[PDB]
Each structure stands twice: as structure tokens, then as C-alpha cells.
């Protein structure tokens, strides 16, 4: 299905496009490499999962990619 419906935005700062990387800070904080408008590919920044609120989806998806063998595949019902 399609998961990503806008809801009360009205000119927002920046919407998480997707995760390109993820790591922990020397402090021990989890940071996920997410892109944003204006920021080129090599301009991408690092945001802590904390700042990434309601972005679990993306991260989750991104995590799945990295993860090796975890989620089961299914056919297409309709």
C-alpha cells in the first residue's frame, strides 16, 4: 500500500526525504543520514532519531534495507 499522507503542514521546515546512512555519535546517540531540499547529496546532514519524530517509517524502511534476512516476502493480493 501507500503510506505517506500529508496532514496539517502549511509551509513546513523540511520533510525527511529518506535515510542514506545511520550511525552513532561519540556520545552514544543514534544519527540517521537524511536528505533535505537545498542540501545536495554531499550536503546531506545527520539527524538523531530523536529529532526524527514521526519518521520511524523511513528509518524502519531504511533499517530493513540494511538488515539482512528479517522480513518475510509475500505475494500480491490486490
Domain ranges of the chain: 1-78
The three-state secondary structure class of 23 is strand
Residue closest to 57 by CA, chosen among 19, 21, 28: 19
Q: In sequence order, which ranges of the chain are alpha helices (DSSP H)?
A: 56-66
Query: Do residues 32 and 47 lie in contact, with contact meaning Cβ atoms separated by under 8 Å?
Result: yes
Experimental method: NMR
- Around Cβ 37, how many Cβ atoms within 10 Å? 8
User: Rg of the chain's alpha carbons, rounded to an integer?
Assistant: 15
Distance CA 77, CA 27 (A): 46
CA dihedral sign, ordered 64, 70, 76, 78: negative
Amino acid at each position: 500500500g501507500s503510506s505517506g499522507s500529508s496532514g496539517m503542514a502549511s509551509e513546513e521546515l523540511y520533510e525527511v526525504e529518506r535515510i542514506v546512512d545511520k550511525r552513532k555519535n561519540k556520545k552514544g546517540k543514534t544519527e540517521y543520514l537524511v536528505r533535505w531540499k537545498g542540501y545536495d547529496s554531499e550536503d546531506d546532514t545527520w539527524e538523531p532519531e530523536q529529532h526524527l519524530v514521526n519518521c520511524e517509517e523511513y528509518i524502519h524502511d531504511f533499517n530493513r534495507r540494511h538488515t539482512e534476512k528479517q522480513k518475510e516476502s509475500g505475494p500480491s493480493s490486490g
